[PDB]
């Protein structure tokens, strides 16, 4: 997260870290056994780490659970990043409580101008590389469709939206992929891609989760 | 680029 602030421990209890001997993507706990992340984060041997704040120190509220299954959307396209969503089943259910909790799926898509919270352990520098220890948060508006398509001509599908600032200076960055964009207590987006991080007129692009609510429900129902 | 570590550009 570039231009964000330290969230505070336990303040984003649905945020997970995907770990393979290092943090490589975030995700969101949507119920005690399932996490939503980005399809481009897929890899074998994922350990899901719940209740984290400092990802380098065991501080107390952590739960490390191996992924049992990673269901990448069958129409994910790695070139266009269309349908960039993956469900992860946990080997074992999480212990839900204060410090660890699920986030609700939306029943409706969000309007332009809605304020959202984006969080993650990604890079905090636009030109450089500085990875935080602790979770970083950032408030950002969903931008209009026309501004999103003007920023990325030919590249925005129905399953995407842009959020952030056209002035630059505040954005999600590498390491934040697969994490949550929460608006009004509902998961509306998944961190997916962009041209760099926090660049002028190149806002972050996000997977539009309201287009996937039936897919998520039916898949979870089947596995 | 995707925002994964490492990025996929
Ligand atoms: Ca920790």
Whether B3 sits inside 8 A of A24 (CB atoms) is: no
Query: Under 8 Å CB-to-CB from A76, ≥6 apart: which residues?
Result: A39, A40, A82, A83, A84, A85, A86
**Number of residues in chain A:** 223
Contacts of residue B5 in chain A, CB cutoff 8 Å?
22-25, 122, 174-175, 177
- First CA to last CA across chain B, in angstroms? 4
CB A3 within 8 A of CB A138: yes
Out of B3, B5, B6, name the one closest to residue A194 (CB). Answer: B3
Resolution for this model in angstroms, one decimal place?
Answer: 2.1
**Residue A167 CA to chain centroid, in angstroms?**
22
Whether B5 sits inside 8 A of A22 (CB atoms) is: yes
- Strand arrangement of the beta sheet that strand A160-163 belongs to: A5-6, A136-141, A115-120, A180-183, A186-193, A204-208, A160-163
Greatest Cα pair distance, chain A, in angstroms, is 47
Contacts of residue A40 in chain B, CB cutoff 8 Å?
2, 4, 8
Whether A174 sits inside 8 A of B8 (CB atoms) is: no
Contacts of residue B8 in chain A, CB cutoff 8 Å?
40, 78
Domains of chain A: 1-12+103-210 (2.40.10.10), 13-102+211-223 (2.40.10.10)
Query: Under 8 Å CB-to-CB from A21, ≥6 apart: which residues?
Result: none
DSSP secondary structure letters along A45-72: S-EEEES-SSTTS--S--EEEEEEEEEE
CA dihedral A177, A23, A137, A130 (to 10 degrees): -100
Out of A22, A78, A174, name the one closest to residue B3 (CB). Answer: A174
The H-or-E segment that residue A189 falls in is strand A186-193
């Amino acid at each position: 997260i570039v231009g964000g602030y330290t969230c505070g421990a336990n303040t984003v209890p649905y945020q997970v870290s995907l770990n393979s001997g290092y943090h490589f993507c975030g995700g969101s706990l949507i119920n005690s056994q399932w996490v939503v992340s980005a399809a481009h984060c897929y890899k074998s041997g994922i350990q899901v780490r719940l209740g984290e704040d400092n990802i380098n120190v065991v501080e107390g509220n952590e739960q490390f659970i191996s992924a049992s299954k990673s269901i990448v959307h069958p129409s994910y396209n790695s070139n266009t990043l269309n349908n960039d969503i993956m469900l992860i089943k946990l080997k074992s259910a999480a212990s839900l409580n204060s410090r660890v909790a699920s986030i609700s799926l939306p029943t409706s898509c969000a309007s332009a101008g809605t304020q959202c919270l984006i969080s993650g352990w990604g890079n905090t520098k636009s030109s450089g590389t500085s990875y935080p220890d602790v979770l970083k948060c950032l408030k950002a508006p969903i931008l209009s469709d026309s501004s999103c398509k003007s920023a990325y001509p030919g590249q925005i599908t129905s399953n995407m939206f842009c959020a952030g600032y056209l002035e630059g200076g505040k954005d999600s960055c590498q390491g934040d992929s697969g994490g949550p964009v929460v608006c009004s207590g509902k998961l509306q987006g998944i961190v997916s891609w962009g041209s760099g991080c926090a660049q002028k007129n190149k806002p972050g692009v996000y997977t539009k989760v309201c287009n996937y609510v039936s897919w998520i429900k039916q898949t979870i129902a089947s596995n | 680029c995707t925002k994964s570590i490492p990025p996929e550009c």
